[model samples]
Target: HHHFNLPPGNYKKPTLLYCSNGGHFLRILPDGTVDGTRDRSDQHIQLQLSAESVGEVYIKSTETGQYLAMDTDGLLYGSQTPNEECLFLERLEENHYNTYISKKHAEKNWFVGLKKNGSVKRGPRTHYGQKAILFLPLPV
Candidate 1:
């Protein structure tokens, strides 16, 4: 029941998905509060949820990525800037998912590969660009 009303170019609260070499980060420090400290303003709601949701949401402390599943349904989703790849992760029985739905790299480019025994093999996968907006089954 928590639906987000994110507007275009409005990177305030739930709209911003700041990406970096580490990953993406959501701006939950309000409009202006100096160095990502303090919990007030527009980001208050989102930050509060992030603080309380805990186990229901996946938060990467070592990385600088946005928590995509918050402020919306429990559906795992991702959004990137224009020309950037949108990486969506789902808990398909844990640690596994279908694949990145909208990626900029070619199908031959191996951005993500299945891990065997926690080790990944190198190769270009031909599974990208093969999907057309998938609709997952509703939770029963």
Candidate 2:
């Protein structure tokens, strides 16, 4: 399986999260809505992922300065600050891809997912084995 090349150094490399099914990058737009975009180099697509531990992580936008967050209904959004809703369990699946599940909403199995046509998929509509939920992290 692949993993993040995490380290504590000056040369911090951001990660580009690409949904294999959507065939696009997970981008947090300036309007604070989460979506998928075709351009990997787009500033909104770059993420500075911070982890308090291996299991939990906070995904932040390098350009927008917002944290990837979710609501009670599993609607993905952006937050100005990291909170319980912003915490995600970053799991490396058996297929050598990754999936983000809400830490606070773990019991509901709410996942951060994308549709085949580069649209955001609501958490309730996603499953662990769904291709729409599988993401490959390309470090940049």
Candidate 3:
């Protein structure tokens, strides 16, 4: 279990989202998609977080030059332009881990995560045992 050092002052700075998978970093590929396979700094994702609706955010991948988005089927993708599917609601859990829920499926509690082999997928928000559902910021 890796402990995360959280950002101070409302996450106003650029940060790398380190997944709870122990060795993976959330990443965006050039093909306009999202994943969590990066193990090193080369092309490591730098996500710029901005305020959207109250308690929500817009995540843009600085490396791939895309925005993290979710499809109608609850699949995770990357978009060239930000839209409603690209919006995420940030929730701080009691364990201090941050969970990102899709604004499009907030009613369903659909959250993003990295599968065992680093594939991006959506799962329930309370399913923290999945590990990937927990995201933390790497020290900038």
Candidate 4:
């Protein structure tokens, strides 16, 4: 299992979200489109995390000032408000990587999944492939 070994008061720091697909990381464009791509070290992709009730969080991008949000249709994007769709339940998996599950959520058990070919989409939690299920933070 991978351990984050997060330091105290780490929530407010910027973070690089590394995908389990190897070299891809979560990138949010100015238009709020979310994707998994080879690391560009884009500051827009840097996220500032805020602790929420329990293990949940509202991740806001340092560049766009938008929150990482999941829609009812299970699509991932960046939103300007901390709406219900923006609330994600963060769970630490047995592998020690983090898995984010929706709250306004989806009817079909979809998760924020990163595709192997640099696409970000939502799919069934168990069937979305390994890359889609695991997300690790490269703290900055």
Candidate 5:
């Protein structure tokens, strides 16, 4: 499991992992609940256009089924964006951080891979052209 340091006022601790079943869950935390992610590591998570995972709902609907859907070719689509452009997180200071989302080809989407042949690099980024807290909702 990955551990992400939560920014101040944006953290909810004692994480519980969840895999999609077949219901709409908008809340960040569900009370008195265990993270239903025991078998998720081997599953593939699809990135839908809506940014809301519907596969999670299906898993909860049945006694036995995959909570998240795997790609047809077993590709990891949600791991990166559509291109080299990526959104990353940078820790600014204690309890402070920012998100750096950039584009090399100026496309609406981005991709993630360890290869360093991209058109851009990560460095100090400013939000609103000034110091502001930003974070990519996803990883690169």
Candidate 6:
């Protein structure tokens, strides 16, 4: 299966999201901001599973206390509230990487992506095969 259970290290623990596309780390600021950084250093993660064994999760910054979210216009943001936009369907790819697709607009098939310069990519500009959507979840 192209989709598989997330590595156990990510469950109920802190993690670092490594963007395979750009070699950047997904980071969040204290004010609920989202960006990609080449630092590749320490970061935080706390995934809230949406259902039992569903592989859906909330990309949360434990330090920033915000959840990653995207809007109807494909704008990315950090939301403090646990709304539908903050939920992502975490899928493992054939390349052994992962793609985080927004659960709220699952029909739209938007993905969490990053640019080569270590910046966030808008959902509309993201795709499964694009190097932008590939991420490697790291151990805390």
Q: Best candidate per lDDT, number?
A: 2
**Between which residue pairs do clashes occur in model 6?**
none
- Superposition error at 10 for model 1 (Å): 21
Instruction: Name the lDDT value of residue 112 in candidate 6.
Output: 88
lDDT against the true structure, each candidate? 0.24, 0.82, 0.73, 0.70, 0.22, 0.74
lDDT of 6 at 14: 66
Better of 1 and 2 by TM-score: 2
For 85-140, candidate 2 gives per-residue lDDT tens digits of 99988877764777888888887788899899888888788876789888888877
Ranking by lDDT: 2, 6, 3, 4, 1, 5
| Candidate 5 global Cα RMSD | 16.0
In candidate 2, which residue pairs get closer than 3 Å at backbone N, Cα or C atoms, i.e. clash? none
Ranking by TM-score: 2, 6, 3, 4, 1, 5
Residue-by-residue lDDT tens digits, candidate 4, 5-38: 3323356568877777656778777898888777
lDDT of 6 by residue, 30-94 (tens): 67667787765545433333342467787777776788899898877888887888878888776
By lDDT, is 2 or 3 better? 2
Model 2 off-target regions past 4 Å?
1-12
Q: Would you give me the overall lDDT of model 1?
A: 0.24
Candidate 3 lDDT over 52-130, as tens digits, reads: 6556788888777788888888888889998889988777655577778788887777787877677776645335456
Candidate 5 ranges beyond 4 A from true positions: 1-82, 87-95, 103-126, 129-133, 136-140
C-alpha-based local distance difference test score of model 4: 0.70
lDDT per residue as tens, model 1, 44-112: 223211222212222222122333222121122222221133233211211222222212232333222
Per-residue C-alpha lDDT of model 5 across residues 1-140, encoded as one tens digit per residue = 11244333222211112212221121111221111222232222211111122111111111121122213222112221222322222122234432222223213212111112211111222222322222222210
Segments of candidate 4 deviating more than 4 angstroms: 1-10, 106-108, 124-129
